[PDB]
């Protein structure tokens, strides 16, 4: 069961490769391991995105027997599992709690030259302890370059592409075949928001023939659901910032900043405390 001299391999506990509990017994702290028998392309995206707040810290990286090992910090449960703990029903003030963190944990990615493609409620992870208020984003797997490190020069525009991550929360460029920018995080970000919101999207549960049917389904249906229409009976923020991510160019920089604003403005208009007592503390 040893992992790089001072790891314990537990028992696998989900996938993202599969993940494991373990232990660094020198250190006496539990951590979570990502075994693989792609690894290597996200340990380096991980090890650029370091020092980010609400990024995890990679303890360990190397190879054991038949397969190359990851080591993380441990983290608490995922946003679905939290929803879905919450019987798929979020307040208004868990839903703004949790979207100024994940707007921040999209900056702090696109800063560091990455989209990260596959925006959803299963890659933010609640940190635990000491910081159980805190957003963390996870799963570099289908993340990609944007610009040059150096030259800070965008990747051109190119159409005809796959669904490079989930139908539900795709961008409708994403639907339309357009690569993936900056704008396309925050737009997922935003239908993320919704469902929270609804317990469910429009599109949701959509049957087909093929999964290529549905995704055709899937954006068929978010192209024809007005903004209004999806936000209907929610604070008129939720449009905004949905309407604000539709109008973004292709290699515009976002104003995060007004976006999170926007969320704020409206958290204060509520006279909600940022206390960080989401829904799943009450319980
Ligand atoms: C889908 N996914 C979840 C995690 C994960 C990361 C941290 N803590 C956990 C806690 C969450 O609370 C329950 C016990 N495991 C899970 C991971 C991962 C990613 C990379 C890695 F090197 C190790 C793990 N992927």
């Given at each position: 069961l040893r992992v790089g001299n001072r790891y314990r391999l537990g028992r696998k506990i989900g996938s993202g490769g599969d993940i494991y509990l373990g232990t660094d017994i020198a250190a006496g702290e539990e951590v979570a391991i990502k075994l693989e028998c792609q690894l290597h392309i996200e340990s380096k995206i991980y090890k650029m995105m370091?020092?980010?707040?609400g990024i995890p810290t990679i303890r360990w990286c190397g190879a054991e027997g038949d397969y190359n090992v990851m080591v993380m910090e441990l983290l608490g449960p995922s946003l679905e599992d939290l929803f879905n703990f919450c019987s798929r029903k979020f307040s208004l003030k868990t839903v703004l709690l949790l979207a100024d963190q994940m707007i921040s944990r999209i900056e702090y990615i696109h800063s560091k030259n990455f989209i990260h493609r596959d925006v959803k409620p299963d890659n933010f992870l609640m940190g635990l302890g000491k910081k159980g208020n805190l957003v963390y984003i996870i799963d570099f797997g289908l993340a990609k370059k944007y610009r040059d490190a150096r030259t800070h020069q965008h990747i051109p525009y190119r159409e005809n592409?796959?669904?490079?991550?989930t139908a539900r929360y795709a961008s409708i460029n994403t639907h339309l075949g357009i690569e993936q920018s900056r704008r396309d995080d925050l737009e997922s970000l935003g239908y993320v928001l919704m469902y929270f919101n609804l317990g469910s999207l429009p599109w949701q549960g959509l049957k087909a023939a093929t999964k290529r049917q549905k995704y055709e389904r899937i954006s068929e249906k978010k192209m024809s659901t007005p903004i209004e229409v999806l936000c209907?009976?929610?604070?008129?923020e939720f449009a905004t910032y949905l309407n604000f991510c539709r109008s973004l160019r292709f290699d515009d920089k976002p104003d995060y900043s007004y976006l999170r604003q926007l969320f704020r403005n409206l958290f204060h208009r509520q006279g909600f405390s940022y206390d960080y007592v989401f829904d799943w503390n009450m319980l």
């Open positions: 370091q020092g980010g707040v592409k796959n669904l490079t991550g209907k009976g929610y604070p008129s």
